[PDB]
Design a protein around this ligand. Sequence first.
Ligand SMILES: Nc1ncnc2c1ncn2[C@@H]1O[C@H](COP(=O)(O)OP(=O)(O)O)[C@@H](O)[C@H]1O
Ligand SMILES: Nc1ncnc2c1ncn2[C@@H]1O[C@H](COP(=O)(O)OP(=O)(O)O)[C@@H](O)[C@H]1O
Ligand SMILES: Cc1ncc(C[n+]2csc(CCOP(=O)(O)OP(=O)(O)O)c2C)c(N)n1
Ligand SMILES: Cc1ncc(C[n+]2csc(CCOP(=O)(O)OP(=O)(O)O)c2C)c(N)n1
Ligand SMILES: [Mg+2]
Ligand SMILES: [Mg+2]
Ligand SMILES: [Mg+2]
Ligand SMILES: [Mg+2]
Ligand SMILES: [Mg+2]
Ligand SMILES: [Mg+2]
Ligand SMILES: [Mg+2]
Ligand SMILES: [Mg+2]
Ligand SMILES: [Mg+2]
Ligand SMILES: [Mg+2]
Lengths: 312, 308
Amino acid sequence: FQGSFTMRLKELGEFGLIDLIKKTLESKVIGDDTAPVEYCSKKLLLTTDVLNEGVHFLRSYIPEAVGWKAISVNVSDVIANGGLPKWALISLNLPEDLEVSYVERFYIGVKRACEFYKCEVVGGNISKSEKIGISVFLVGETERFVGRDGARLGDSVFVSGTLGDSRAGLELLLMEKEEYEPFELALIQRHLRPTARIDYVKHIQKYANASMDISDGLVADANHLAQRSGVKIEILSEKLPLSNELKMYCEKYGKNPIEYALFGGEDYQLLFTHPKERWNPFLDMTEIGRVEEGEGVFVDGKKVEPKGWKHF
Amino acid sequence: FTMRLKELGEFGLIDLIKKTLESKVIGDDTAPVEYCSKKLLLTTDVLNEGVHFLRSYIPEAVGWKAISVNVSDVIANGGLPKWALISLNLPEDLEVSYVERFYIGVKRACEFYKCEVVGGNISKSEKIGISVFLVGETERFVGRDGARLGDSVFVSGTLGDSRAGLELLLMEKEEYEPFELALIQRHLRPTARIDYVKHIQKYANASMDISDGLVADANHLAQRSGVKIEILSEKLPLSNELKMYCEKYGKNPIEYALFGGEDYQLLFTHPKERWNPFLDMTEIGRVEEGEGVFVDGKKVEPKGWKHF
Ligand SMILES: Nc1ncnc2c1ncn2[C@@H]1O[C@H](COP(=O)(O)OP(=O)(O)O)[C@@H](O)[C@H]1O
Ligand SMILES: Nc1ncnc2c1ncn2[C@@H]1O[C@H](COP(=O)(O)OP(=O)(O)O)[C@@H](O)[C@H]1O
Ligand SMILES: Cc1ncc(C[n+]2csc(CCOP(=O)(O)OP(=O)(O)O)c2C)c(N)n1
Ligand SMILES: Cc1ncc(C[n+]2csc(CCOP(=O)(O)OP(=O)(O)O)c2C)c(N)n1
Ligand SMILES: [Mg+2]
Ligand SMILES: [Mg+2]
Ligand SMILES: [Mg+2]
Ligand SMILES: [Mg+2]
Ligand SMILES: [Mg+2]
Ligand SMILES: [Mg+2]
Ligand SMILES: [Mg+2]
Ligand SMILES: [Mg+2]
Ligand SMILES: [Mg+2]
Ligand SMILES: [Mg+2]
């Protein structure tokens, strides 16, 4: 009866586990999208995100897209804290019966992403496994690190692009349809081949008081920002940026676009704060709320309940 | 009717990856990148359940090993470890204490090697997976290319111990003799040879660590340097414990020294005169023009661990 009452990961939760890990390591740097380290008057940003078969993607998806996404989700953490991607490593867990062509096409996608984001994969690892596992490590660089702590009272809360598209794309992919309409393919693109907002780096680096990307969902991720900055975040649902593709999807399948914008994950858009006075004539940012004294995240006045994707 | 990984092989696959990426840096234990007049060394090694360890093993040792095997690649190319990240694939039914103890082991290793884990990732999974990424630094990078004609070939410590340790564990015995526990310790808690960094930086022409097996890894060195490596089995360093093990179970220690993996000792080359009398290094062969790896004048087929 050794394991009769022992606490398992399912009971603690992923973030409670990270808290334990941080405490165990007596770490002061853990908590942001990247780990900033001082090196030669500048800061290098270290991060790692993974794509596991059955968890983040399916083997039926074109390998090139998975390779593009593998690099993109990692670049997203780097640009979210004000840095530019430089060097990456890829650790692969591969089934011995996997087609060689899958790995080749995967790297063609990786190469395409690296050429786009201006970074390079300089190495990695290979291990046998039951299914496909893709663990990428990325090193970026910045002149001014912007993490999740730093949001100031009075600041406005912004997001880039539109929210909820990726979740719709995921659902469309899981439908295994023999044919998708144009708007559906666009949503699928947002899910399978997200584009890290590297176009935002200079703005974030120069004006953001707090910044991060949205990978689990707006409310859930806004919660992390609120807690690390020690403030209250008030969001207005009517201001959330929605794409016409998402609206078409919700109309066709009977869904609520606001639900997708608030709880949909993997959009990899940015969530940051700074004075409303600060803006950019070329960026698609949308003001969705403000930073107030207190705690928790509120939507339309209600504190609701932060959902977001959970591994356990 | 399409080629699968098991048909191409791990290294044939890496060759394809390198070509696809048009990479010139891939090929060594670490990837050296120029930065701030110096070089940063990037590397990643992993421990997967059922592949590198069993869930029944003490987690503290797994944590120590996770860091150690990565530090091994860094110090093998002349660098010192600095910052690491750990990506974990974890089953939701796993005990929280397992992860805590794993990190206690990671913390101990970091304190010993003087590096720090600054972040990582968590993903749900069916099997335990531990992927470590490490960034090191060096004033002089020493990779697998550079071995010179006439160079003596050296190794650190003893070879074959880890393989014996694994075999002992697989026996699942109630209890083992002291020498058997010593071998098990070498398998479960290897120690990266960070004590060789200065030596490698100052005098090595080529260097790497032995993780798959002496002959198999020497083959990588021989090919990247474009030379032939002649090894003499009688010179291979054997521990008293490995000899005791082979005596007890009727095995040949030379077989373990040549094909045993996970010892994480170093394999490097340089003129014999640079032999350091303060380090546990042993001359096991020489570098000469040509190709291939020979043992006692016989071209032995490169075995070593293969994932597929
Ligand atoms: N999946 C991968 N992608 C890119 N490079 C890889 C990958 N796997 C291995 N490599 C590179 O292949 C070379 C040999 O790797 P490996 O056999 O694991 O030796 P080591 O563990 O000593 O680095 C190294 O340069 C490694 O970085
Ligand atoms: N296994 C781990 N070990 C150490 N730190 C971790 C681990 N997993 C996650 N972290 C850290 O916890 C914080 C939150 O991680 P995560 O939820 O993955 O957000 P993100 O992907 O934006 O970095 C980050 O600082 C991350 O580096
Ligand atoms: C087959 C499949 N099922 C479900 C999902 C949904 N999903 C899996 S992970 C995730 C979001 C973020 O992934 P994570 O590993 O948490 O990245 P991080 O948030 O750590 O950057 C989502 C919405 C998916 N992408 N694929
Ligand atoms: C349960 C189990 N079975 C078999 C082994 C043997 N084994 C697995 S990996 C490996 C050696 C090296 O591992 P690898 O992932 O290739 O590390 P790298 O050479 O890339 O540094 C060995 C000898 C083991 N350690 N554990
Ligand atoms: Mg991160
Ligand atoms: Mg993030
Ligand atoms: Mg993450
Ligand atoms: Mg992330
Ligand atoms: Mg997440
Ligand atoms: Mg390596
Ligand atoms: Mg090595
Ligand atoms: Mg390796
Ligand atoms: Mg290695
Ligand atoms: Mg190997």
